[PDB]
Scaffold this active site. Structure first.
Site, short mmCIF file in Angstrom:
data_model
loop_
_atom_site.label_atom_id
_atom_site.label_comp_id
_atom_site.label_asym_id
_atom_site.label_seq_id
_atom_site.Cartn_x
_atom_site.Cartn_y
_atom_site.Cartn_z
N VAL A 64 18.10 88.67 -83.15
CA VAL A 64 16.68 88.13 -82.87
C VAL A 64 15.71 88.74 -82.28
O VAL A 64 14.54 88.44 -82.38
CB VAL A 64 17.06 86.64 -82.10
CG1 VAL A 64 17.75 85.70 -82.94
CG2 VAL A 64 17.61 86.93 -81.04
N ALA A 83 19.49 78.59 -81.81
CA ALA A 83 20.48 78.44 -80.72
C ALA A 83 21.02 79.95 -79.93
O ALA A 83 21.81 79.74 -79.00
CB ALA A 83 21.49 77.51 -81.03
N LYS A 129 18.31 74.13 -66.85
CA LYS A 129 17.96 75.14 -65.98
C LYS A 129 16.62 75.78 -65.92
O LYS A 129 15.93 76.43 -65.43
CB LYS A 129 19.23 76.34 -66.13
CG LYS A 129 20.55 76.06 -65.68
CD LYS A 129 21.68 76.67 -66.07
CE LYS A 129 22.83 76.87 -65.16
NZ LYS A 129 23.53 75.54 -65.37
#
Ligand SMILES: NC(=O)c1ccc[n+]([C@@H]2O[C@H](COP(=O)([O-])OP(=O)(O)OC[C@H]3O[C@@H](n4cnc5c(N)ncnc54)[C@H](OP(=O)(O)O)[C@@H]3O)[C@@H](O)[C@H]2O)c1
Lengths: 329, 327, 327, 329, 329, 327
Positions: A64, A83, A129
Site C-alpha cells: 500500500v 484493512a 486506539k
C-alpha cells in the site's frame, strides 16, 4: 436488498484476520462478481488461494506504500475495503516510521488510487486506539481516519464515498489475549500474566465486525465513522473463564498502553448520533455536498447525544461475565 | 554550553524562531545561528531586523531531505520549530500537515544523524496529548519519531528530545491579540466558543527559556513539560474587556474544552521536578538512561498513580489582572 | 570469525533465516544478530521463540534504500535472503518480483558499501542458471549485481559473494511436506508433474552450514556451489508413499525437467574443490583475486572443457529410504 | 492488406540499427500517418533528421527510464515498437544496474505509458541471448520479455496488445563480427581473432528482422514470442568468406558468452507452435481473455512440436556456406 | 464581453502582491464561479481568507514543486494564472537550487497538471529580468517562459492554451524602492541610498499589471509573450519626488543587477509585433497548429517592428517626472 | 598538479572529452582517467581507440544522483562537460535540456561534495551570457549553481569553477565542417543566415589547454574567459569557398547576431589578465578570496566601467586565410 451483487471488490490486507473472514462472508452471502486480495506476502497468498480455491478470487502482490501498484490494482474496482496495517502497538513504538508509511501514507495512496479509478465506495478500518490515542499506532490510524473522511470533498468526476469503521479488540484475534490465555491454563503454569487490575477492553468477534462493515456499506453516505455498540469486559474475568482456578501475577503496563479504550471521545460527543445498535461520528469539517447523517441509506433514524457523552470500555451499558466468554473459542 | 556552537532552527522566521534567535544572540556565545525556512520575504526582513554577522539564512523546506542534509552540515544543535499548526486548515489540508509535520520530522532526524549533530529539540504541542484533531495527531507522530531516534549509535551519539507546552500568549494571530482589536473596535460583544473553556498559558519568552534549560539538562529521549498555569477563557475575555458582553458561540472544527499536557495513561512514565515534568520514553534504548537525574543533577520523583496534567484540574490559574501584565 | 561481530540478515524470518539465526546463536560469539523483514506478525513470534539478548528486530523492506542505510549501521556481515521465490506468483506479479529481487539487491548493496560492511553473502538459486522463468531471471540479475559490487574500493573493502543451491528438503510449503499430507490423507494417488523430473537436494541445515563455510573462505566475487545429490521425483513419491499410484499430471507454468547448478557455457570459469565449486567472476576487478586458493588455503582445480552440474547428469543420488532420514 | 495506414507509430531507440532500418521500411511501404523516434542522443537525432528530412517524422529526446516523459511521448500513438536497449554484453557485465534500469525498468515504463495512452499494439525486441541466458544482458531481456507478455492481462479500457519478437545476430550489425572481419583481411593482419573453434551463431539481416517485425504486427493476437526460422553459421566460415586465405589465432571465450545461442528452449518446446517460416512460444501463464495462437491474424495455421524440441544455432536444419556470406556486405 | 463568467480560476502564489490584487479584481468585475488560491503559507492564507471572507474563494495549501498536489488542485479548473515564485534576486543568488525548483520545476508541474485536467487557458507571469538575464532569478524565469510557450504543441485531448505576460517593477511593491524611500525621507536620514547614477527602471502599478493580465486572457491564442507599453524612470527622480530635498550617497551595484532592464531583446525584435498599447513576442519555434498573432482574439491588428528594435527602460518613448510619481502611494 | 590524481569527466565521449582525455594521458601523470557518459556504443569505441590502462569507463547519466555518487568515489578532479547543446532541439525538448544541464549540474555538485573532490570545472558557453535561447539559459543556471557551490565547507574544501568560451572550430557537426561538404559538393551557393553575423573562435585544443591552465590557477568561484578572436561569418564562407555565391537566408530559432562573453552589466566584476578574464562571483563566500591574484601568482586588473567582451566589438579578428590553418 443485496446492494453488492455483480460488484468487483478489492480489500487491502486481505490475508489478515478480518480479510480472510470478510472474504469468506462475501463469497458466501453475496453475488459479488470478483474479490481482489491486495497484500505483500506470497506465502500467505498462496495458502489463502488453496484455502479458498474460488474462481471469483484474484490475488495481487503489492504494497500500500506503492501508489503505482495500487493504481493498477484498483482498475475496475467498485468497492475497496482497506484493512492493511501495522497494528502491533509495541512494535510500532520501536519502528515508528514503518507504522507511519504503512498506515498514514498507505491510506493516502489507497485514497488516491480509488479516486483515479472512480471506485464507488471505500471503507477504512480504524480502531478504538485511534480515539484520544497515546501510542503511535493509534496516532497513525487517527491520521488515517482523518484522510478518509476528508476525501469526500473532491467532487471531480464520479463521487467516490469514503467511510470509516471503528471498533476494538477482536476475541481470539491471532496473537491476542485469548490465544495466550489458552496456552496458559493449558501448558501448566501456576501464574497468569496481568498488566493492571482495573484493565478493561471492548470485545467483539471477527464475524461481528465483518458483518458490521457490510451493513455500514449498505447505509453509508460517505464521511461517517461507524461505531458498533459493543459490550465491555474486565481482563480479570477473561482470566477466570479462560482460566478456571489459577493464581495471577502482575507485569505492569506495557508500552503506550491504556487502561481503558475510548470509542467516542467526550470532546466529540456533539458530533455523535445514536442509533439502535451503532453510532455515527460526523465529520469535524464541512463538505461542499453535505449529507444528513441522521438517516442512513437504510432509513434508520439517528438521535443526538448528551453534550457530555464519552463512550468507553469503562462506562459501557453492558458487560460480559466469565461464563459468557467460554461460549466462544 | 553554546559558546562556539553552531545552531540551526527550522521555522526560524516564526514567532518562536525570532524570539529564540534574539535570545540566543543576546545570551550565549553561539558562533553561528542558522534560520531554515521557505519564505524569502520573511527571511530578508528578518535579516534586516537582525543585522548580525552570527546569522546565516538558508531557504529550504523540511519536506526536502537533500536540502536539509546540506543545511545541517557543521551544525552542533538543531531546534525544530517548523510546522503547519492552524488546526482548521489542517483538517482541510490533511496531507499537507502530514507532509510537513511528520515527514518533516523524519527528514530533520535523518539529516541530523548524517551530519552528526549533538543535540536536537523538537517543539511539540499540548494538542498532541490524547489528540482529537489532525494537527495534534501529526505532532504526536512527530514526538514519537524524535524519541525513537535515540536508538541510533553510529558516528557521534546524537540526542533527540521534545519540549511540549500549549498556547503562547499574544502569539502572532491568536486569541489575546485579535481579541484586543475587539475591545478596541467598540465591539458590542466578545466571541466566546464556550463558557467552561480553559487553556494553559505561557509567554513566548518563557517557552524559549524552557527550551534552553531543556538543552542543558537533556539526556536524549525526554519530553520536557513545563509547570505552567491554566486559565478560564471566561476571565480572559473579562480582562481585555472588563465591560463587554459575550457572544456565546460554538466549538470550532477540532477543539477540546480542556487541553491535556500529561495524560493519565502515561502518568506512570512521568517524573516531577520543581519547575517541570519529564515523560519518560515508552521504549527501551540499546543504552539505558536515568531520567530521574538531569544533566544539571536535578532530582525528580514519580507522580501519583492516576495523575494527570490538564488545563482544568490544574492548581495554578491566571486571573484577569494577571494577564495584562504580559500583553 | 564472528565473535563480537554484528550480523544482519534480510528475510530473517524465513525458513533459511530462522535456521541460520539459530545456528549463529549456538555456534558463534556473534555480538548481535539483526533480522530485517517486513512482517510484524512473524517478527514478534520469532522474538518470542528466540528470547535472546543478542537479537534485534528491524521492520523494513529491501525496496526501501533509506531504511536499509539505517538498519545496516554498525553491521559487519550481511546475509541477504529476502526474496519473492514462488515461481508461479512471480509470473503473475512480474514487477513485484523484480522490485524485491533485483532492486532489493541493489539497495542492500548500496547500504552495505555506505555502512562499510566487511562481508556480504546473497542467497541465489539453481533456477538462476540458464533460467527460463522470471523468478530465476531476477536472481541471475541479483547474482550479477552482487559479483559486480566488488569493483568498489572506497572506505573499507566490502566483499560480496553468492551462495547457490536448489530446493531445500521439507522447506515450509514444498514438495515433501505437503506430500506427506497426501500419503497421510489416504489419498488414492500422488500428483506427479512428470516421470523424468529430477532435482537437487540439500537440507536446511546443510545450506546454513555451507553459507557459514563460504564466509570463512570467501575473497569476494565467488558464487559458491555445494556438491549435493540429485534425485528422481519418481523415487521421492515412492518414498513417502511406498504403496500409492501416481497421477501423472503436467508441467507447471515455468518448470524445467532438470535444474542446472553450473552451466556448460560457464564451465570454463569453474573450479572444483573436495566439497564444492566456485564459479569465477566473468569480469576483471580493479584488483585481481586467485580463486584457486580459498581463505582457508584450500586448493581447487579447473574442470573438463564441456563440464556441467545438472540434476540429471549427476553421479550422486538419493533413493527412497535415503529421504525419510531427514523429513 | 496494409493494416497500418493512418496509424501514428512510436519506436523507442529509433536512432539505432533496427530503428533506422525499420523507419525507412515504414515510410517507404505504408501510409502510416506519423513515425515518432524516441531516444536520448541529440547528435544521432539531428543527423537522422537530416538523413531522412521527411515531414512524417517526429523526434522526441527522452529516456525510457523516464516514465513521465514516455507518458507524454505516447500520447496519440497507435503502435509502439520498443527497440531501445543496452545490448553490449561485456559492458552490461561491468555496468549491470545500468543494463537493468534501461532494459527491465525501461520495459515497465513503456508498458505503463502504452496502457495510459491506450495504444493498440506493442512489439518488444528480444534476443536469442534471452533464452536460457548466462549473461546479464540476456537476463534483463528475459525479464523484459516476461513483462511484455504478462501485460496482456490488464483489461482496463481498450485492450492494448503486447507481443515480443526474438531473433539474434544481425549481419554487419554496427560493431559486430563482419565490421571487424572487414578491417582485418583489409588492414593487413596475418591473424584472425577467434574465440572458440566450435563457435556458431544464428544469422539474419537488418531488413529481414524489420520485415519480420512488420509481419508479426499483422498477425499478433498479443502475448506471443515470435521467432523466425533462420539459418545457422559457424564462425570458421565467416572467417573464410569474409577472409580469403589468412591464418587464425584463439583468444578464448569472452565474458558471459555462449558457444551456441538457444532460440526455443528445450524446457519450453511444449509451448512452441511451428509455422512455415516462424515459431510462436505461447505464454507460460493463462490470461483472462485467452487466444488461440494456432491461427495467426493472417489465418496461418500452426503445428505443435516434439516434446523434446530445442531450436538452437547448433541443431538448425539449414546453414550458410562461406560463398553465401560474401553475397552480402 | 465578459469571456470569464462561470469559470473556475486557480492562481498559484495567490497570497502575493499580484495574487491579492488580481483576486480582488476578478471578484469585483467578473461573474467567475470560483477562485482558488494555491500557495504554501497557512498564516497568509488564513489572513487573506478573513481579509476577503468571500464564498467564491477557496484556499489550497500546496507547493508548486509538488506535482501530485497540483494535479488534485487543478481538478475542475478552467483558467490558471501562475504567479508563484521566488523573485528576490540577491536571495536567489545565494539559494540557486531553491529558485530553480520553484520557478523552473514549478512551471513544469503546473503545466503538467493543467494538461492532465484539461484547463482551457494558462497565463504565466514573467519579468523584464528574464530578457537577456544576468541573475539566476531571471534565468529561471526565462526557462519558465520557454516551457509555457513550448507547451502549446501537445495536442492531446482539449487544447489548453499557454501564454506569458512579462512586465517589470511594480510601484510600491512590498519590499521595493518606494517602501524604503518612504522610510527614509520619513525616519530622519540625511542620505538616500543609491546604487548607480544612470540607474533606470520600467514602472507600472499593481492594478495596471492585473488589468493587463485579464485583457491578455481575452485576446490570447496561446504561445504569446505579452508586453505592455509602459513608461521608464530614472531612480534619481524617484529619490526627489519620494524624497524632497535630501542628499544622496552611493553603495554601488548590488548582486546580478542591471543598470537597465530589457523588455524586448534586440536579438528577437524580428518576432515582436507592435499594437497600440502592447507587444507580442512570437514563439521562436513552430507549432503543429500555428496561429496568426497579428490579430488578437479582440481583432486588434498588429504591426511588425524595425529589425533593430530594442525595447528597454533606457530608450523608451515616455518617462515619469518626479511630480507624477507622488501622484501615487 | 595531476600526477597520481584521479580525474573524472562527464560527457567524456564528446568532442571536448576525447581531446581532453588525449591531452591528459599525454601530458600529465594522472593515475586514472574516468569517462562518465550514457552511450555504450561510443564508450566501447572510445575504449578501442584509447587502449590505455589509465582509462576506466563508467556508463551513467548525470540525471542519476545515485550513479554519480558511486562513480565519483575516489576522484580528485571532475571536469563536467556533459550536456544537451543543440539549441533548436533544446527549444523543442525544453524539459530534457533542463534535466540534463541544470539538474545534472546539481547532481554532479552533490556527488563531488560527498566524495570530497578537490577541484571541479564545468564547461559553460558564451550563449549563457545575456541568453535568449533555452540552452543558454540552462547553462547560466548551471554556472550559477557551480559558483554558488563554493559556500560549502564540510570535510575537504571542494573548489568549483567555470570555463566559458564559444563555438569550437570544426566541432563535430558544426559550421566549418559541414560547410566544406558544400564547397566540396560543387554547391552553387553557400547558406548564410545573415551578413553581419559574427562569432568567437577557439580550437578544440586551445579550449582543452585553457581548462588545464584554469585548474592550475583556480581558487574556486571563478568563471574563466579566454581572450579569443572574433570572426565575421562573411569571411568564413569566403574562406572555405573563395569562389561561391551566398544564399542569404534567415535567422535560426534562437540565434543572436553577436555572442557575448562578458556582459556590460557584469563588467564591474571582471578582471583582466594577459591571456584571459575572470568574472568574479556575485555572492560573498563564508571565506573571501582575492581573485586579482591566481594560484600561479598572476596579477589581474579591473576593466573600464562600461566594458564588454562581444564578438562584434572585439579587436582580434580571424580573416579567411587565417582559418584554413586549423581545419
Ligand atoms: N515583484 C515584482 O515587482 C514583479 C514584477 C513583474 C512580474 N513579477 C512576477 O509575478 C509573480 C508574482 O510576483 P509578486 O510581486 O506577487 O511576488 P510575491 O508577493 O513574492 O508573491 C509570490 C507568492 O508565491 C508564493 N509561492 C512562493 N513559493 C511557492 C511555491 N514553492 N509553491 C506555491 N506558491 C509559492 C508565495 O506564497 P506562499 O509564501 O504562501 O507560498 C508568495 O505569496 C512572480 O512570479 C514574478 O516573477 C513580479
Amino acid at each position: 436488498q443485496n446492494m453488492l451483487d455483480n460488484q468487483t471488490i478489492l480489500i487491502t490486507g486481505g490475508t489478515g484476520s478480518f480479510g480472510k473472514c470478510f472474504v469468506r462472508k462475501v463469497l458466501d452471502t453475496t453475488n459479488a462478481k470478483k474479490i481482489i486480495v491486495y497484500s505483500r506476502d506470497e506465502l500467505k497468498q498462496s495458502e489463502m488461494a488453496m484455502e479458498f480455491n474460488d474462481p471469483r478470487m484474484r490475488f495481487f502482490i503489492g504494497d500500500v506504500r506503492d501508489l503505482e501498484r495500487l493504481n493498477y490494482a484498483l482498475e475496475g474496482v467498485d468497492i475497496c475495503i482497506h484493512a492493511a496495517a501495522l497494528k502491533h502497538v509495541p512494535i510500532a513504538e520501536y519502528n515508528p516510521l514503518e507504522c507511519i508509511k504503512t498506515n498514514i501514507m498507505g491510506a493516502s495512496n489507497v485514497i488516491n488510487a480509488c479516486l483515479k479509478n472512480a471506485i464507488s465506495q471505500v471503507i477504512a478500518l480504524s480502531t478504538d486506539k485511534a480515539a484520544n490515542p497515546i501510542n503511535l499506532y493509534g496516532a497513525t490510524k487517527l491520521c488515517s481516519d482523518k484522510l478518509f473522511v476528508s476525501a469526500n470533498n473532491f467532487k471531480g468526476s464520479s463521487q467516490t464515498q469514503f467511510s470509516v469503521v471503528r471498533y476494538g479488540n477482536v476475541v481470539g484475534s491471532r496473537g491476542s489475549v485469548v490465544p495466550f490465555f489458552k496456552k496458559l491454563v493449558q501448558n501448566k503454569a501456576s501464574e497468569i500474566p496481568i498488566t493492571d487490575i482495573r484493565m478493561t477492553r471492548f470485545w467483539i468477534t471477527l464475524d461481528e465486525g465483518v458483518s458490521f462493515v457490510l451493513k455500514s456499506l449498505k447505509r453509508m453516505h460517505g464521511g461517517e465513522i461507524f461505531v458498533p455498540k459493543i459490550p465491555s469486559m474486565k481482563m480479570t474475568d477473561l482470566a477466570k473463564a479462560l482460566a478456571p482456578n489459577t493464581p495471577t501475577k502482575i507485569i505492569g503496563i506495557r508500552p503506550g498502553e491504556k487502561l481503558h479504550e475510548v470509542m467516542i471521545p467526550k470532546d466529540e460527543s456533539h458530533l455523535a448520533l445514536e442509533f439502535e445498535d451503532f453510532f455515527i461520528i460526523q465529520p469535524t469539517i464541512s463538505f461542499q455536498t453535505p449529507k444528513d447523517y441522521t438517516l442512513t441509506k437504510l432509513h434508520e433514524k439517528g438521535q443526538k447525544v448528551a453534550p457530555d457523552f464519552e463512550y468507553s470500555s469503562h462506562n459501557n451499558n453492558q458487560w460480559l461475565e466469565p461464563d459468557d466468554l467460554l461460549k466462544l473459542l
